Amino acid sequence: SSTASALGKLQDVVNQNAQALNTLVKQLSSNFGAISSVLNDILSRLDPP
Amino acid sequence: FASVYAWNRKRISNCVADYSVLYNSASFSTFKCYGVSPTKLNDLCFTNV
């Protein structure tokens, strides 16, 4: 009860999973060399070619 | 109109214009526009000119 940090394995697993998911969802906002990071603007501003 | 060495710059803002009325009349120069496609200029609401 009094002493904490006795469950390092479970916390490490949970933190690894959450960090991986967060990095995946954050990678969605990159530009990847295009002219915009959102496709709705691209389809509403450019030509199909 | 001034020379190329003294090209005239001006600001256009706070108005409401249209481009199809100018686009359809094939009278002024020739249109080749990057970024926004010429035919889709009217529908979007960019800040100023």
Curated annotation (Swiss-Prot), chain B:
Changing T30A: In strain: Omicron/BA.2, Omicron/BA.2.12.1, Omicron/BA.4, Omicron/BA.5, Omicron/BQ.1.1, Omicron/XBB.1.5, Omicron/EG.5.1. Changing S29F: In strain: Omicron/BA.1, Omicron/BA.2, Omicron/BA.2.12.1, Omicron/BA.2.75, Omicron/BA.4, Omicron/BA.5, Omicron/BQ.1.1, Omicron/XBB.1.5, Omicron/EG.5.1. Binds to host ACE2. RBD also interacts with the N-linked glycan on 'Asn-90' of ACE2. Cleavage of S generates a polybasic C-terminal sequence on S1 that binds to host Neuropilin-1 (NRP1) and Neuropilin-2 (NRP2) receptors. Interacts with host integrin alpha-5/beta-1 (ITGA5:ITGB1) and with ACE2 in complex with integrin alpha-5/beta-1 (ITGA5:ITGB1). May interact via cytoplasmic c-terminus with M protein. May interact (via N-terminus) with host bilirubin and biliverdin, thereby preventing antibody binding to the SARS-CoV-2 spike NTD via an allosteric mechanism. Attaches the virion to the cell membrane by interacting with host receptor, initiating the infection. The major receptor is host ACE2. When S2/S2' has been cleaved, binding to the receptor triggers direct fusion at the cell membrane. When S2/S2' has not been cleaved, binding to the receptor results in internalization of the virus by endocytosis using host TFRC and GRM2 and leading to fusion of the virion membrane with the host endosomal membrane. Alternatively, may use NRP1/NRP2 and integrin as entry receptors. This is Spike protein S1. It comes from Severe acute respiratory syndrome coronavirus 2 (2019-nCoV). The lineage of its organism: Viruses, Riboviria, Orthornavirae, Pisuviricota, Pisoniviricetes. The gene is S. The chain holds residues 347 to 395 of 1273 of the full protein.
